[PDB]
Amino acid sequence: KIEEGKLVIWINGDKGYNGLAEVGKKFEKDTGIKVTVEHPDKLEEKFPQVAATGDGPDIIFWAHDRFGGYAQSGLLAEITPDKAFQDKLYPFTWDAVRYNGKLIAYPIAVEALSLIYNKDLLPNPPKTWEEIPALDKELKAKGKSALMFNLQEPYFTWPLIAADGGYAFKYENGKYDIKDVGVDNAGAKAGLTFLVDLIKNKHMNADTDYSIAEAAFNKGETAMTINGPWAWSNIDTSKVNYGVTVLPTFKGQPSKPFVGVLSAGINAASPNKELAKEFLENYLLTDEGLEAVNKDKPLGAVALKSYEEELAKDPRIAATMENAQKGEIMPNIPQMSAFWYAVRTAVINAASGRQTVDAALAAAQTNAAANQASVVANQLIPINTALTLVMMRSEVVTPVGIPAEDIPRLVSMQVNRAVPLGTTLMPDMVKGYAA
Numbered sequence: 001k002i003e004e005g006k007l008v009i010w011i012n013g014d015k016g017y018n019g020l021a022e023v024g025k026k027f028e029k030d031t032g033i034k035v036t037v038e039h040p041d042k043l044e045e046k047f048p049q050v051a052a053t054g055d056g057p058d059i060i061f062w063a064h065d066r067f068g069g070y071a072q073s074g075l076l077a078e079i080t081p082d083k084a085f086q087d088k089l090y091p092f093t094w095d096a097v098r099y100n101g102k103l104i105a106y107p108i109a110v111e112a113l114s115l116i117y118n119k120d121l122l123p124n125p126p127k128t129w130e131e132i133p134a135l136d137k138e139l140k141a142k143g144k145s146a147l148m149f150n151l152q153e154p155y156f157t158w159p160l161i162a163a164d165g166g167y168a169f170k171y172e173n174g175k176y177d178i179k180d181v182g183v184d185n186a187g188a189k190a191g192l193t194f195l196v197d198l199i200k201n202k203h204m205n206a207d208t209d210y211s212i213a214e215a216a217f218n219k220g221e222t223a224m225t226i227n228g229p230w231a232w233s234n235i236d237t238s239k240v241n242y243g244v245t246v247l248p249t250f251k252g253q254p255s256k257p258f259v260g261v262l263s264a265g266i267n268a269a270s271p272n273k274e275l276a277k278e279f280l281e282n283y284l285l286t287d288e289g290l291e292a293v294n295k296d297k298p299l300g301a302v303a304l305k306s307y308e309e310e311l312a313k314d315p316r317i318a319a320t321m322e323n324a325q326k327g328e329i330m331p332n333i334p335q336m337s338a339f340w341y342a343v344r345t346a347v348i349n350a351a352s353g354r355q356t357v358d359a360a361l362a363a364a365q366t367n368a369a370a371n372q373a374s375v376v377a378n379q380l381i382p383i384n385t386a387l388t389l390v391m392m393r394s395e396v397v398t399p400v401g402i403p404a405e406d407i408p409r410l411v412s413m414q415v416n417r418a419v420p421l422g423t424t425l426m427p428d429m430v431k432g433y434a435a
């Protein structure tokens with residue numbers, strides 16, 4: 001699918017890919033180089049799996065946190081901006097995409113979660129997490145809710161987990177100490193406990209995901225959500241009169257969102273490295289280029305100084321940078337995805353009641369040092385067999401499969417194909433796995 005003299009680009013489905021495609025059509029008009037923008041599911045998992053070979057796209061877009069792992073594995077071309085080009089972008093954004101000395105991607109924009117609120121339900125939004133139970137009660141009476149946001153992705157809960165002292169890897173000297181993990185300290189427990197009580201007290205549902213929370217906010221049913229700049233386009237379109245503001249504090253500490261830098265990497269395997277560079281440097285990272293993407297879905301505070309100077313005038317963007325400042329830039333180290341999986345698991349388990357907070361975070365501290373494991377058949381499993389534990393073991397494999405953490409829930413569910421011993425159990429092999 002990668003061919004000399006064409007570009008294939010991958011970007012996430014929540015970003016402005018139609019806008020990016022317009023930049024691509026301008027590139028093609030100038031250069032004769034066809035550009036195809038795709039937004040695959042699980043692209044960030046898909047990329048390391050397929051570029052491992054020589055496949056995948058010429059250009060990949062993601063937050064910088066995933067980049068060091070791609071670099072560590074040799075999947076990224078070292079990029080070669082000249083000093084004048086580097087000077088067009090904020091130094092702290094190049095920092096985000098520097099790994100083991102080398103620039104491994106182009107920074108595009110600075111993403112931080114903010115509190116989004118409906119001015120016609122809550123004209124004065126809460127300054128603290130602690131007042132939200134009371135607010136939800138008052139609003140429940142009016143047939144509304146106070147707050148909904150995606151609880152299936154740790155990105156969204158981390159600001160609260162971090163507020164009172166949770167952290168990922170301790171930053172010491174000038175290094176991240178990957179032996180000093182902070183997902184199971186007192187502050188982390190306090191934050192996750194506070195969320196678990198929101199659910200226990202019926203102020204939030206453990207099953208709330210991205211699209212549920214978005215539909216509810218945009219339909220005027222809940223007073224508040226937590227989301228990024230990319231979400232503002234759809235709220236605009238729904239004519240909710242909304243504001244963007246600083247996240248609530250918890251125990252008098254600011255929420256500390258993990259800050260991402262949307263970045264564009266060039267595939268080490270691409271025979272279009274120069275074309276990709278000229279697309280990125282001369283078409284995308286221009287006022288016009290970024291405008292076109294931003295108009296589709298807002299980017300946040302862009303890395304390009306000249307266009308940010310304009311965007312910075314928007315209170316929404318100032319709100320984004322205030323939240324950014326209170327939070328922390330994500331590491332880009334390879335251990336970041338293991339960290340995220342460990343915390344994903346902990347949050348989902350604690351919130352659903354499958355595990356206590358303390359137990360869930362103890363497991364997260366241990367798992368942050370490991371890697372996401374998948375279900376592997378421990379026996380020949382004939383077609384239509386109801387799964388028992390002795391049929392399933394756990395292994396760190398690529399491509400990943402059903403999460404090993406799902407084994408208990410798999411018990412009694414049926415496979416729809418014969419699964420040989422040692423085969424990775426995939427989601428499409430199990431009947432009813434969608435639920």
Ligand SMILES: OC[C@H]1O[C@H](O[C@H]2[C@H](O)[C@@H](O)[C@@H](O[C@H]3[C@H](O)[C@@H](O)[C@@H](O)O[C@@H]3CO)O[C@@H]2CO)[C@H](O)[C@@H](O)[C@@H]1O
Pocket residue numbers: 012014044045063064065066111153154155156228260336337340341344
């Ligand atoms: O939860 C499992 C998940 O963990 C890792 O995903 C994290 C991303 O790496 C990280 O950048 C961030 O993702 C957010 C984006 O930055 C933002 O642009 C927007 O698209 O929302 C994203 C959150 O949904 O946080 C997530 C974790 O929540 C890991 O790399 C993934 O492969 C893995 O599936």
